[PDB]
Ligand SMILES: CC(C)=CCOC(=O)/C=C/c1ccc(O)c(O)c1
Ligand SMILES: CC(C)=CCOC(=O)/C=C/c1ccc(O)c(O)c1
Ligand SMILES: [Ca+2]
Ligand SMILES: [Ca+2]
Ligand SMILES: [Ca+2]
């Protein structure tokens with residue numbers, strides 16, 4: 001897929017499984033419109049969010065529901081969610097892997113961008 | 117201050133200076149109301165954003181303009197900005213630290229008494 | 230494999246390719262003995278370092294040569310290398326994925342540990 | 346001090362207090378010679394490790410006993426310790442920050458004038 005998200009748990013040393021996330025795309029009127037959503041698999045990965053045809057140029061936001069994840073494990077975390085906002089496909093189609101590493105009071109996010 | 121933000125540059129090994137950010141508070145209609153902003157000092161820190169009386173429980177967002185920072189250094193960045201969204205809950209001081217790279221950022225909260 | 234290492238470049242948003250690393254295992258006399266070595270592929274991954282039979286209980290150190298990596302890209306980085314030291318297989322065989330995220334003055338490392 | 350270390354806890358959102366560490370300098374025979382050590386304060390910081398005259402160019406290693414820290418909190422950790430190995434090169438102050446999780450750590454250097 002042109003967009004994949006991978007989430008890891010830094011407390012348990014495991015993929016972060018069943019983590020919900022919503023993707024939005026910024027509309028011409030500057031509002032965030034729903035684009036795609038899903039949950040991470042047993043591998044901590046979410047594939048198949050979109051297609052090369054649908055994933056046009058624009059500004060996208062991935063909101064990862066990290067708070068529900070920690071809560072279900074008995075932990076009250078700091079962040080409401082982890083947010084990743086980026087311009088996609090500005091110079092033609094790319095594949096994007098967004099990786100998030102989660103701790104209760106901290107998170108890291110990185111992007112790997114490759115040319116098809 | 118009950119809220120301080122510190123920003124570091126992982127490419128140059130330095131404070132991230134003159135980084136602009138806005139702080140928003142979530143309203144009843146679920147929109148973001150601006151309520152504080154500033155830019156980081158030479159030590160990469162932004163102090164004096166709010167007071168104890170003003171900083172009531174609620175959901176807050178700190179939006180750090182990382183894109184402009186990297187653009188001024190001539191480096192193309194991935195993120196439009198870095199956002200930190202959190203609930204403040206009731207003596208507490210919040211220090212939000214953000215470590216910046218062109219294609220990655222990390223943020224941590226140090227919450228003390 | 231029971232041991233895999235993945236290295237990413239946070240400046241370029243890409244896998245870190247051709248990154249050398251050496252693995253050592255602590256000997257009975259407390260010295261580090263060479264165990265395995267290799268370089269990351271185009272995917273930023275290094276597979277096939279060892280086998281389940283060879284990868285016995287012990288304390289292992291992965292030394293990732295991050296300095297040579299940055300130097301070849303024209304950057305003088307802070308760290309000599311990134312080091313990952315851990316006890317492996319203490320409770321029976323596990324699979325270990327060590328992920329390192331590199332910037333010139335910072336690095337992060339995480340482990341994903343799974344039960345075969 | 347020309348060298349300061351700061352350690353933070355990503356699970357509890359706090360300074361990592363009473364974390365022991367040793368600093369070594371690389372010798373001509375390629376062995377590590379101990380030369381400073383201490384444990385972090387209530388602010389998670391360790392100051393006074395060395396002086397400008399003593400802190401000459403060379404390769405240094407800071408070995409942070411993260412395992413003992415997590416063990417005292419009843420949490421099983423992955424790493425034996427966190428090591429930061431770097432060359433000091435010639436006015437410079439080094440601040441080494443380490444952010445700790447049970448299965449992950451990050452370290453950054455802030456090098457200033
Ligand atoms: C599959 C791919 C291209 C990236 C996924 O990499 C990982 O499994 C973990 C990446 C990572 C993300 C954040 C970190 O702080 C860190 O040390 C590593
Ligand atoms: C006092 C000074 C110059 C930096 C102190 O650093 C912090 O308060 C937080 C640093 C930090 C924040 C996130 C990280 O992943 C990391 O490795 C370090
Ligand atoms: Ca895919
Ligand atoms: Ca365009
Ligand atoms: Ca493999």
Ligand SMILES: [Ca+2]
Pocket residue numbers: 286318319320
């Ligand atoms: Ca055993």
